[PDB]
Every structure is written in structure tokens, then in C-alpha cells.
DNA sequence: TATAAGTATTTAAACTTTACTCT
DNA sequence: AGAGTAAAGTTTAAATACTTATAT
């Protein structure tokens, strides 16, 4: 009572998101964005029914889309205090509501190749025809309603295969954080329709 | 100007509220009900599934009730008709004739021809695109208050209208500004 | 208290995940 | 390794009612 209940819970905010920041070791820019945008949902009344940890790791995952840092939602749901289905839809819901649109949110499927592929240990041979193939599969039409994560770890196993640097599909799998059948289902898909010629597997 | 020629819409669930106007014992009514469920811990109304129209009812003690799942608002009529029988036949008496509110209905769709959703995104106003999340383009009308969900096949999903002579209202607002450039 | 959100029900779109089987 | 699959899960709206957490 020297400190209003919004101060202290304002508090307990700000350590849940230096915890965050300092387990996936995120740039002071970008900690700072979500801090910003975590006070924006409060002076909005956005917080009104989801939890403090919900909408803090939402803020995250919002600051990262819109400063152009590759990070997955799973890698903040590995680390928050609750599931991907509520971060997604605390997220959804403070992203509509703060006016942050689809093409302030929009992170290049480029940015995504250069991170997973640094995980991968992947040369720049491969990410560039991996950049390649994903430029090729949106002028076909093929992206629209993909998992964007699920296409970048797709055009990298292709890569892989066809610059002789090969990663398995479990492997990209796991740095892009979507599962192995996803990536087997892209890479049937752009290999047939691009007619895409692969050594073995 | 827009060509909409090709542009369909099918409905695939229509929702309604109903007062029957009498309290009801739910313990009671479970028989009027063979295939139904219930579990006060869990949902406070009783979840029952018609067979003629292939419908689910949701009776509550309040006498109320949800009827959803119908193709028709003739199919809701019917529905509040064999239960509001049933009642009858263990004693209910109703102070007025039963009173039906469309509460809302869902329609799939078809513009006919496909979409970049990443190219429709930046420029469709309040519409919501997360690949990563869900396939389609969740786009909000005011009025009349519905979303309709757009796909890159081209195919769409609009809820919330009270009619289809409003789900096509918010179709055209679609159709008109998918046509901005 | 007055607010929201979750619990349950329906329904399509089209995508991912789950949990395996069979090579 | 990885091909492949069926079924379940994800999203949108609404009314019912009954609970739980919290804004003020």
C-alpha cells in the first residue's frame, strides 16, 4: 500500500521476463520491446482474463516477430510457465488488440534458414539453395497456410541432400521445432512439384 | 464490378436458443432422452443427441435450452417440438408457446479462384494471418459482427452471421476488399 | 460485486501433431 | 533413416449455466 496491487503484479511481470530473456539469452532491444508492449496491454485492460505469464511470454514472442529475431514460439513455451495453446492465444489476442498486423509480425523465411542453419552447422552453400528452393516454392503457390518453420526445415534437409552436407529429416526437425512427418510431408510435396533431383537420403 | 460469379456458400450448423418457459427437473428428463449425457460437476445442462433431426440439445433446469448442429431452422422448429411432446408426456405444462432465437450459423464456401495469404495479409484490413498457428486468414466484419476465414485453396468459413442473407453481406465486404490494389 | 475466461456442443476449412506400422 | 497414415488437435461464432480468479 505504497505500491498499488498494479505495481507489485507489474513487479512480478518484469522478473518473469528477465527470467525469459536471460534463458534464451535475448538482446537487451528486444527485452526492452517486450517490456513495452507488456505496458501497453496493461494500460489497455488486455490482461483482464489470461495470466501474467501468459501474455509476459506472448510479449516476448511478439517483440522477437517484430524486431526481426528468428526465435520459435516453442523455444519460449520450453521455458514459460504454461502451454502453447494459452501463449498462442494470449498472443493472437494482445497482437490484434495492440494494432500489430501481419506485416509488422512478418519475419523472412531467409532469417529463419540462417538460424537454423548455424544450429546445423550448415554451410552458406546450403542455406543459399535453400533460400533458393523457398523463393521458388511461393512463386508456385506452395507456401500459403504452411507452417513457415515447417518449409525453411524442409529446405534445408533438401539442401543438405543435394550440396552433400546431408542432416537427417529428425535433425531439422528439431531445430525448427515442428515434427519429423511435417518436414516429410513438405519435402514430398517441393520435390515432386519442383522437381527437385535427390542423390539418396 | 468485382466478379462474383463463382462465389458459393453451403450452411453446416445453425444455432439456436430456446425458452420453453418451465422449470425443469433434469434428473427427471434424462429419460426423455435416450442417447444423452450429464454430469452437473462438469456441464450444468443435459447434453442430448436427436436422431430425426440429427441434432444435440443442451436442456437446462432453467427450461432453456441450445439446439445446435441443424442444417435448418425448420429442423430446430422440430426439435423443440418432439422434446417440448416428451415434456408433456411426464407432466410439464408450458406458460406460452416456445420461443426461438437463431443465436448464430456457420457456412463453408468457395471464392473460386486461390490466394497468396502472405500478399492478401498485408493489405486486408482486420484480418490476422499465423501460419504457424492456423492455415486460413481470420478476417473481422463489424457489421453485420461475423469472421470469415480464408484459405489459399480459395475455399472460406464465415460464423457468427444470423443469416445467410447477412453471411453474404460480409462475403461481398470481402470480395470488395480483396479487390483494392 | 461486475468482468472475463474456462467447462460442453456444433461445424466446415486445412494444416500439424500424435502414435505407430512397415520398409 | 525414413515412408506413410488415420485420428486427434488447432482456429472462428453463439447461447445455456455454473465455477474460479481478479479488477476496482
Not at chain 1, 521455458?79 to 495453446?85: H, M, N, P, T
Not at chain 1, 501463449?87 to 494470449?90: A, E, K, N, T
Not at chain 2, 482486420?126 to 498457428?133: A, G, I, M, V
Given at each position: 500500500?505504497?505500491?498499488?496491487?498494479?505495481?507489485?503484479?507489474l513487479?512480478?511481470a518484469?522478473s518473469?521476463?528477465?527470467?525469459?530473456?536471460?534463458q534464451?539469452?535475448?538482446?537487451?532491444?528486444?527485452?526492452?520491446?517486450?517490456?513495452?508492449?507488456?505496458?501497453?496491454?496493461?494500460?489497455?485492460?488486455?490482461?483482464?482474463?489470461?495470466?501474467?505469464?501468459?501474455?509476459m511470454?506472448?510479449?516476448?514472442?511478439?517483440?522477437?516477430?517484430?524486431?526481426?529475431?528468428p526465435?520459435?514460439?516453442?523455444?519460449?513455451?520450453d521455458?514459460?510457465?504454461?502451454?502453447?495453446?494459452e501463449?498462442?492465444?494470449?498472443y493472437?489476442?494482445?497482437?490484434?488488440?495492440?494494432?500489430?498486423?501481419?506485416?509488422?509480425?512478418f519475419?523472412?523465411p531467409?532469417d529463419?534458414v540462417?538460424k537454423?542453419?548455424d544450429?546445423?552447422?550448415?554451410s552458406?552453400?546450403?542455406?543459399?539453395?535453400a533460400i533458393?528452393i523457398?523463393?521458388?516454392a511461393?512463386?508456385?503457390?506452395?507456401?500459403?497456410?504452411?507452417?513457415?518453420?515447417?518449409?525453411?526445415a524442409?529446405a534445408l534437409?533438401?539442401?543438405s541432400?543435394?550440396?552433400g552436407e546431408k542432416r537427417?529429416?529428425?535433425?531439422?526437425?528439431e531445430?525448427?521445432?515442428?515434427?519429423?512427418?511435417?518436414?516429410?510431408?513438405?519435402?514430398?510435396?517441393?520435390?515432386?512439384?519442383?522437381?527437385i533431383?535427390?542423390?539418396?537420403? | 464490378?468485382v466478379?462474383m460469379s463463382?462465389?458459393?456458400?453451403?450452411?453446416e450448423?445453425?444455432?439456436?436458443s430456446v425458452?420453453?418457459?418451465?422449470?425443469?427437473?433434469?434428473?427427471?428428463?434424462?429419460?426423455?432422452?435416450?442417447?444423452?449425457?450429464?454430469?452437473p460437476?462438469?456441464?450444468?445442462?443435459?447434453?442430448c443427441?436427436l436422431?430425426?433431426?440429427?441434432?444435440?440439445?443442451?436442456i437446462?433446469?432453467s427450461?432453456?435450452?441450445?439446439?445446435?448442429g441443424?442444417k435448418?431452422?425448420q429442423?430446430?422448429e422440430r426439435?423443440?417440438?418432439?422434446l417440448?411432446?416428451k415434456?408433456?408426456?411426464?407432466?410439464?405444462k408450458?406458460?406460452?408457446?416456445?420461443?426461438?432465437?437463431?443465436?448464430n450459423?456457420?457456412?463453408?464456401?468457395?471464392?473460386?479462384?486461390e490466394?497468396?495469404?502472405?500478399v492478401?495479409?498485408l493489405?486486408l484490413p482486420?484480418?490476422?494471418?499465423?501460419?504457424?498457428?492456423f492455415?486460413?486468414?481470420?478476417?473481422?466484419?463489424?457489421?453485420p459482427?461475423?469472421?470469415?476465414?480464408?484459405?489459399?485453396?480459395?475455399?472460406?468459413?464465415?460464423?457468427?452471421?444470423?443469416?445467410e442473407a447477412?453471411?453474404?453481406?460480409?462475403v461481398?465486404?470481402?470480395?470488395?476488399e480483396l479487390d483494392?490494389?
Open positions: 500500500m505504497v505500491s498499488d496491487a498494479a505495481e507489485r503484479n513487479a512480478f518484469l518473469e521476463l528477465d527470467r525469459i530473456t536471460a534464451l539469452k535475448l538482446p537487451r532491444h528486444v527485452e526492452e520491446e517486450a517490456a513495452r508492449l507488456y505496458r501497453e496491454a496493461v494500460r489497455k485492460g488486455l490482461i483482464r482474463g489470461r495470466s501474467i505469464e501468459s501474455v511470454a506472448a510479449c516476448v514472442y511478439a517483440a522477437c516477430r517484430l524486431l526481426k529475431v526465435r520459435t514460439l516453442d523455444e519460449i513455451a521455458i514459460a510457465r504454461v502451454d502453447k495453446k501463449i498462442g492465444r494470449s493472437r489476442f494482445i497482437a490484434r488488440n495492440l494494432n500489430l498486423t501481419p506485416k509488422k509480425l519475419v523472412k531467409t529463419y540462417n537454423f542453419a544450429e546445423l552447422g550448415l552458406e552453400k546450403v542455406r543459399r539453395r533458393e523457398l523463393d521458388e511461393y512463386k508456385r503457390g506452395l507456401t500459403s497456410g504452411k507452417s513457415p518453420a515447417g518449409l525453411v524442409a534437409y533438401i539442401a541432400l543435394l550440396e537427417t529429416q529428425r535433425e531439422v526437425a531445430v525448427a521445432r515442428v515434427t519429423e512427418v511435417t518436414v516429410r510431408n513438405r519435402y514430398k510435396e517441393l520435390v515432386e512439384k519442383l522437381k533431383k535427390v542423390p539418396i537420403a | 464490378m466478379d463463382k462465389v458459393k456458400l453451403r450452411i450448423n445453425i444455432v439456436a425458452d420453453l418457459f418451465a422449470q425443469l427437473d433434469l434428473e427427471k428428463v434424462l429419460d426423455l432422452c435416450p442417447n444423452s449425457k450429464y454430469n460437476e462438469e456441464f450444468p445442462g443435459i447434453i443427441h436422431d430425426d433431426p440429427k441434432v444435440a440439445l443442451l437446462f433446469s427450461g432453456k435450452l441450445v439446439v445446435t441443424a435448418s431452422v429442423d430446430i426439435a423443440v417440438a418432439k417440448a411432446q415434456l408433456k408426456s411426464i407432466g410439464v408450458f406458460k406460452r408457446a416456445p420461443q426461438i432465437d437463431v443465436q450459423m456457420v457456412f463453408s464456401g468457395d471464392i473460386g479462384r490466394f497468396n495469404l502472405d492478401v495479409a493489405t482486420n484480418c490476422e494471418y499465423e501460419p504457424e498457428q492455415p486460413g486468414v481470420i478476417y473481422r466484419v463489424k457489421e459482427k461475423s469472421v470469415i476465414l480464408l484459405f489459399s485453396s480459395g475455399k472460406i468459413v464465415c460464423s457468427g452471421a444470423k443469416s447477412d453471411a453474404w453481406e460480409a461481398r465486404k470481402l470480395l470488395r483494392k490494389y
